[PDB]
């Protein structure tokens, strides 16, 4: 079972947006689809639920005029539509279902929605060489970016972004003495909003 959500969405204030939740691996019309909103400092909020069989819905009254739940049975996809967007709607939106055969939950990756008047800006990627290596991702907007080391997982420290002059900047450190050089260590970083992917090899 998989719930596929777009990684990010950047919308201007006052506009609207539709986030998709593409499901696979089970009978789409069997289980309620729930939606959850998450912002820092506010924890988790329940938006509502929809049953794809007949589009029966229960809404959190807080989101009555803001969120609209729909489904497309033939494409096994659920949608949430958000109207009159403000910065208050900037958050991560999850879709989730509960399968019973043994109860198991399945969640999407969450869509990071940013409501801002700023334009998309791709990240400038810089290699950090003197063994601990690094990758500097500077001047991107909006969040998020996904960085990966070739793949390498242990000895990886990806630090949270910091907003400097209206752009975001973060760094990642990979700690792998003999391995480098000879073993090509490459910074892999994607900015889903700018549709910009960069590869930068760490060279001495």
């Amino acid at each position: 079972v998989q719930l596929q959500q777009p990684g990010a969405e950047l919308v201007k204030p006052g506009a609207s947006v539709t986030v998709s939740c593409k499901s696979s691996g089970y009978t789409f019309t069997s289980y309620w689809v729930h939606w959850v909103k998450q912002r820092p400092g506010q924890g988790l909020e329940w938006i509502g639920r929809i049953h794809p069989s007949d589009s029966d819905t229960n809404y959190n009254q807080k989101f009555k005029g803001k969120a609209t739940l729909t489904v497309d049975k033939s494409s096994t996809t659920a949608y949430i539509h958000l109207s009159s967007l403000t910065s208050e709607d900037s958050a991560v939106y999850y879709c989730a279902i509960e399968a019973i055969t043994i109860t198991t939950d399945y969640w999407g990756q969450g869509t990071t929605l940013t409501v801002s008047s700023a334009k998309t800006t791709p990240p400038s990627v810089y290699p950090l060489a003197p063994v601990t290596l690094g990758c500097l991702v500077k001047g991107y907007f909006p969040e998020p970016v996904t960085v990966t080391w070739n793949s390498l997982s242990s000895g990886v420290h990806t630090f949270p972004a910091v907003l400097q002059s209206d752009l975001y900047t973060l760094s990642s450190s990979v700690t792998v003495s003999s391995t480098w050089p000879s073993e090509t260590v490459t910074c892999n970083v994607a900015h889903p909003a700018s549709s910009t992917k960069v590869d930068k090899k760490i060279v001495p």
Partner: protein
């Protein structure tokens, strides 16, 4: 609406001990209470439904209990891998409401940071910018201080600091400090030093380079 009170936002523990996260509902919700775990960078994961029943694959180390208004999530033999924020939730009445969340904190032996300094990349200099990055990796406890020095003179402006979550593998913390100057200013100087002050050493840990 129903308010779910998680009175503790943080709970400290050592590996192998027992922790109990309390959750108090403002109304009778029976046993229609769920518990969730959100590890860093991950979506929430359901651990407990019906107050005490575990989802598939959830270990018996996670025990849910309570009924009515008082609810408790007990974690036995807590591992650093369990590091996450824990949310209770009621689904007895619309709308479903979550608790405020409780972050797990692991206590461990004190550790000194692994400090690494990096000169500005050749690519960034061919753009008029110049950033000097210092990594302070895998230390404990979290309290640490970084001092930048240029030709022996302390520099406080233009410094960007960032801290990671507690590492779920070794319960350590990490910090990156980035000193950003213009290209002309960076070539006006030679010595660039990053100093780290931590309780593990009376003297700072120094890393530097000459351009």
């Amino acid at each position: 609406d129903i308010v779910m009170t998680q009175s503790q936002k943080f709970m400290s523990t050592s590996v192998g001990d027992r922790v109990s996260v309390t959750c108090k509902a403002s109304q009778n919700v029976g046993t229609n209470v769920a518990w969730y775990q959100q590890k860093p960078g991950q979506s929430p994961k359901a651990l407990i439904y019906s107050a005490s029943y575990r989802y598939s694959g959830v270990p018996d180390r996670f025990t849910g209990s309570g009924s009515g208004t008082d609810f408790t999530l007990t974690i036995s033999n807590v591992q650093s891998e369990d590091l996450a924020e824990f949310f209770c939730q009621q689904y007895n009445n619309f709308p479903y409401t979550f608790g405020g969340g409780t972050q797990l904190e692991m206590k461990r032996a004190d550790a000194a940071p692994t400090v690494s300094i990096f000169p500005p990349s050749s690519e960034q200099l061919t753009s008029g910018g110049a950033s000097v990055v210092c990594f302070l990796n895998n230390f404990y406890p979290k309290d640490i201080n970084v001092k930048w020095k240029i030709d022996g003179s302390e520099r406080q402006n233009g410094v960007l600091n960032s801290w990671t979550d507690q590492d779920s593998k070794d319960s350590t913390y990490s910090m990156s400090s980035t000193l950003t100057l213009t290209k002309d200013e960076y070539e006006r100087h030679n010595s660039y030093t990053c100093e780290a002050t931590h309780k593990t050493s009376t003297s700072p840990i120094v890393k530097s380079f000459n351009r």
